[PDB]
Amino acid sequence: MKASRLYTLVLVLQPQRVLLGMKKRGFGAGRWNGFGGKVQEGETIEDGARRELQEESGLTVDALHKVGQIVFEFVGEPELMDVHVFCTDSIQGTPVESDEMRPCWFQLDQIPFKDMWPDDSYWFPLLLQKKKFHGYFKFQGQDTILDYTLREVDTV
Numbered sequence: 052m053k054a055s056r057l058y059t060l061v062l063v064l065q066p067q068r069v070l071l072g073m074k075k076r077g078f079g080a081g082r083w084n085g086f087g088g089k090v091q092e093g094e095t096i097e098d099g100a101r102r103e104l105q106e107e108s109g110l111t112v113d114a115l116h117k118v119g120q121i122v123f124e125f126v127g128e129p130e131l132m133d134v135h136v137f138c139t140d141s142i143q144g145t146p147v148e149s150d151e152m153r154p155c156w157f158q159l160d161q162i163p164f165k166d167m168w169p170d171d172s173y174w175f176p177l178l179l180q181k182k183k184f185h186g187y188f189k190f191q192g193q194d195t196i197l198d199y200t201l202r203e204v205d206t207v
């Protein structure tokens with residue numbers, strides 16, 4: 052059995068567009084992603100997702116709704132990433148570029164799948180259909196899925 056670390060991922064999804072963030076530096080730059088990071092001690096996962104959204108994008112929201120959970124496993128890494136996925140209820144401000152991340156809106160017929168994590172091609176369509184899901188993806192490096200599961204669920 053492995054240990055898992057908790058992470059969040061927030062999709063700012065509006066009726067016709069979605070906000071994504073492009074990684075500018077570090078390792079993994081060039082890829083568009085939702086907003087999130089590691090859950091911290093003592094906060095609920097949802098509150099951690101809100102905190103990370105604000106830190107990462109500048110957007111503040113009072114509430115999210117949970118839409119999925121995805122476990123990532125990487126060859127050579129014993130720790131699993133347990134990612135809790137949320138969508139925004141409403142927003143009321145503008146996103147901000149940081150030294151690390153550039154936010155950009157995409158129309159929902161221009162979702163930039165080829166420049167997103169490969170798993171997003173599988174689960175983000177469910178998110179657009181307002182379905183809930185559980186997933187698991189095993190990666191070799193950043194680009195190659197060796198095994199995965201995806202299932203629609205009634206409760207995340």
Ligand SMILES: Nc1[nH]c(=O)nc2c1ncn2[C@H]1C[C@H](O)[C@@H](COP(=O)(O)OP(=O)(O)OP(=O)(O)O)O1
Pocket residue numbers: 058059060061084085086087088089090123134168169170171
């Ligand atoms: N395969 C994948 N598909 C996806 O859509 N999002 C992924 C992903 N793999 C990781 N992510 C997301 C999850 C989370 O929002 C983020 C990873 O969090 P980070 O490690 O950057 O967190 P922190 O910024 O809290 O970490 P520190 O560097 O310790 O400050 O990237």
Ligand code: NA
Pocket residue numbers: 088089103
């Ligand atoms: Na963090």
Ligand code: NA
Pocket residue numbers: 087088
């Ligand atoms: Na980060």
